[PDB]
């Protein structure tokens, strides 16, 4: 349904497989029953984390996620965004999996894979609001899994119905900006290692209320409200990255969203917008079923 590695998806070698809980996952589950301003990711905390890397010049392009031993999920706008003259071909990119350090070439840890083909949702709307901001990248050859490389699960209807609720927290990860960056400054820019932040899903009415940009059912927003005190948000560079939730039903990590867009980063009254993975999952299914798992 997604490719080799789906059966054991969402279970991390360094955590679930060892009956070890990461430092902030209980915060997520508590929200179900009860990157700016984030923190350094733990080793193997997000084994599905993928870094979209430009072949030449060598630079970080976006975040992404591993959904199988041969398929990588990301935001459509990460590969195609005409307004900024962006339109990559499978030949210009590489995917770096199992990474922690943003800049270091982590030999014997990370895996750099070439792309066989990229697919962008046919109805992706880059013109207005990045509607249907989803894309898939098939690796030239399957990658072997490791303590640092493991696919995330794609949500089924029941899991999505249960967890996609206002207040329910998800986890966003990426090597994106540590803060809104507009001009040269000696302050914090990009992180040294993968950043992680847990954020609550926001009620659709508030999401639409927070922006002049037209919101569609193919997206959802997350982040704390000003009155909630806590902060946190994805930022430029986190695009394409995963917004995951740990299922209380089978303790597997599911990707409910993809870092899509926002206005500024961690601004009061603003919320990060993510691609609604479940609602667009059937496209992923159609593509993978057509072009082999």
């Amino acid at each position: 349904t997604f490719g080799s590695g789906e059966a054991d998806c969402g279970l991390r070698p360094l955590f679930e497989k060892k009956s070890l809980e990461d430092k902030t996952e209980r915060e997520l589950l508590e929200s179900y029953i009860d990157i700016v301003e984030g923190s350094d990711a733990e080793i193997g905390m997000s084994p599905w984390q993928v870094m979209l890397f430009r072949k030449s010049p060598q630079e970080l392009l976006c975040g992404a996620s591993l959904i199988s031993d041969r398929w990588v999920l990301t935001a459509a706008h990460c590969l195609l965004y005409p307004p900024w003259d962006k339109n990559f071909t499978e030949n210009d990119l590489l995917v770096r999996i199992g990474k922690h350090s943003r800049t270091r070439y982590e030999r014997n840890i990370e895996k750099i894979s070439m792309l066989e083909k990229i697919y962008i949702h046919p109805r992706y709307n880059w013109r207005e609001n990045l509607d249907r901001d989803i894309a898939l990248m098939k690796l030239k050859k399957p990658v072997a899994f490791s303590d640092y490389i493991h696919p995330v699960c794609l949500p089924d209807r029941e899991t999505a119905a249960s967890l996609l609720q206002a207040g329910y927290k998800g986890r966003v990860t990426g090597w994106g900006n540590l803060k809104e960056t507009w001009t040269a400054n000696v302050g914090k820019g990009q992180p040294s290692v993968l950043q992680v932040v847990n954020l609550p899903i926001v009620e659709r009415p508030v999401c639409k209320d927070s922006t002049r940009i037209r919101i569609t059912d193919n997206m959802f927003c997350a982040g704390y409200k000003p009155d909630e005190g806590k902060r946190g948000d994805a930022c430029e560079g986190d695009s394409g990255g995963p917004f995951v939730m740990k299922s209380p039903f089978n303790n597997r990590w599911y990707q409910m969203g993809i870092v899509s867009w926002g206005e500024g980063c961690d601004r009061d009254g603003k919320y990060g917008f993510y691609t609604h993975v479940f609602r667009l999952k059937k496209w992923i299914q159609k593509v993978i079923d057509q072009f082999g798992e």
Binding site: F53, K55, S56, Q58, E59, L60, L94, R96, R102, T103, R104, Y105, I112, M114, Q190
Partner: peptide
């Protein structure tokens, strides 16, 4: 600022 990756990945 990015450590260069093995050239075998650029081919």
């Amino acid at each position: 600022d990015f450590e260069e990756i093995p050239e075998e990945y650029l081919q």
